[PDB]
């Protein structure tokens, strides 16, 4: 009572934000943007109905999407105190309400290609061929509706075979945070529609 209940809830939310950024090794500018969005959600009364954990986790993801920091939602879900379903609802909800449009939140496939390729130790030759396949899939109308990470995983997979630096469907799936079946579904589709020839597997 020298601190309103708002203030104590903000301190709790800021501790949760600090815990997430330290754990994900997120840069200061991202953490600051997450905090700014969170305060906006509070100002607009957008917390009512959902957990502070839920909302702060969504503000960190929204901040990564606004600043083009290629983190996947799952990395956050892994350390957030709530599930993907719940963080996804809070995230779509506060994005809608803070006017974070599809355009403002868009992150090019290329940025994920580089991020995932880093974790996979793949060369710039592979990155290039994958970016090339993603550009062709987009021109042909095969990308809409599909999980973007699923497409990146499958283009890296295909390109790793084609450039002799093979990685397994399971490996790419693990770093892109989707299932192997998804990588497999996109792989098949990309190979036959773009007529891609592959050594072996």
């Amino acid at each position: 009572m020298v601190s309103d209940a708002a203030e104590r809830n903000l301190a709790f939310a800021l501790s949760e934000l600090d815990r997430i950024t330290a754990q994900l090794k997120l840069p200061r500018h991202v953490e600051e943007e997450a905090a700014r969005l969170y305060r906006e959600a509070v100002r607009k009364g957008l917390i009512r109905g959902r957990s502070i954990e839920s909302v702060m986790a969504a503000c960190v993801y929204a901040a990564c999407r606004l600043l083009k920091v290629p983190r996947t939602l799952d990395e956050i879900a892994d350390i957030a105190r709530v599930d993907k379903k719940e963080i996804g609802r809070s995230y779509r909800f506060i994005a809608r309400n803070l006017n974070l449009t599809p355009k403002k939140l868009f992150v090019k496939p290329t940025d994920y290609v580089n991020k995932f390729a880093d974790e996979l130790g793949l060369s710039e030759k592979v990155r290039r061929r994958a970016i090339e396949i993603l550009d062709e899939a987009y021109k042909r109308g095969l990308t809409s509706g599909k999980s973007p990470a699923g497409l990146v995983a499958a283009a890296l997979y295909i390109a790793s075979l084609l450039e002799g630096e093979k990685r397994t469907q399971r490996e790419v799936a693990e770093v892109a945070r989707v299932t192997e079946v998804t990588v497999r579904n996109r792989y098949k589709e990309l190979v036959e529609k773009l007529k891609i020839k592959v050594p072996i597997a």
């Binding site: 779509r92 599809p102 809409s144 509706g145 999980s147 973007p148 990470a149």
Partner: protein, 181 residues
């Protein structure tokens, strides 16, 4: 000007709230409905599934109901009938004739051409597109208040309108926006 000659809709689900105007003892009612499920612990009403009109009914002690699954207001009127019938058949009296209100309809449809959702989401106002969570663009119309899900195949789902006439108003608005450039 936008040729809409290929756009079509099909009703898929109709939802109505009904006031029977009479209290009800849900335990005594459980019989009137063969296929029934009740657990006040989880949900306060009786979940009943009619067979003729293939509709699901939710009966509450307050005498009010919800009818969903219907493909026509007619199927709902019939469902409210069979039930009212079976009720008098165990000693229930109604202060008025049943009051039925269509609360929501869901339509599926096809626009007849494909779309690149990334491009659509760039200029379509009142929309969301998050392919990592759901495949379609989510378009929110203020009036008539409804939501349209637009997929890359050009198929659509319209929910929240209270009539086909209104759903078509929502779709006409979407079509008009999809035409700006």
């Amino acid at each position: 000007m936008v040729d809409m000659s290929k756009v079509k809709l099909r009703i898929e689900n109709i939802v109505a709230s009904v006031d029977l105007f009479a209290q009800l003892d849900l335990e005594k009612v459980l019989d009137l409905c063969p296929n029934s499920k009740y657990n006040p612990e989880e949900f306060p009403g009786i979940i009943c599934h009619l067979d003729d009109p293939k509709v699901a009914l939710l009966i509450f002690s307050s005498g009010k109901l919800v009818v969903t699954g219907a493909k026509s207001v007619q199927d709902i009127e019939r469902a409210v009938a069979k039930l009212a019938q079976k009720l008098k058949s165990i000693g229930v009296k109604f202060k008025r004739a049943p009051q039925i209100d269509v609360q929501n309809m869901v339509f599926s449809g096809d626009i007849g051409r494909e779309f690149n959702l990334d491009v659509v989401a760039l200029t379509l106002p009142n929309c969301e597109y998050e392919p990592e969570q759901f495949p379609g663009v989510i378009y929110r119309v203020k009036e008539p208040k409804s939501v349209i899900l637009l997929f890359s195949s050009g198929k659509i789902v319209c929910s929240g309108a209270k009539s086909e006439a209104d759903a078509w108003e929502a779709v006409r608005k979407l079509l008009r926006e999809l035409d700006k450039y």
